[PDB]
Amino acid sequence: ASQLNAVVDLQDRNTELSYQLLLDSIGDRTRYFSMWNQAVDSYDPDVRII
């Protein structure tokens, strides 16, 4: 009925990074979930450090 937009998004927040940190905080991060394509990037420590 009333087009009172209930999402007021600013360009100062970084919602992507916020969700990235929240997913780390509440649950384990290593495990892979295919549905959300939930697979955190990571390097091989024997490649980053020789």
């Binding site: 940190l21 780390d24 905080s25 991060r29 290593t30 955190v40 450090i49």
Partner: protein
């Protein structure tokens, strides 16, 4: 004579990071509990080299 961990980090900065992340530092340094140290936490990614 202000370095720690056999690296370049000063005692001040290491103390501040550990205090900010694990409430550790006023009662002796020690490896924080694993659940407090997530993937994006400080200590996990700390990697001194020489």
């Amino acid at each position: 004579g202000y370095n720690v961990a056999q690296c370049n980090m000063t005692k001040d900065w290491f103390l501040v990071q550990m205090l900010a992340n694990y409430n550790i530092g006023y009662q002796g340094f020690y490896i924080p509990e694993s659940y407090k140290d997530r993937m994006y936490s400080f200590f996990r990614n700390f990697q001194p080299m020489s």
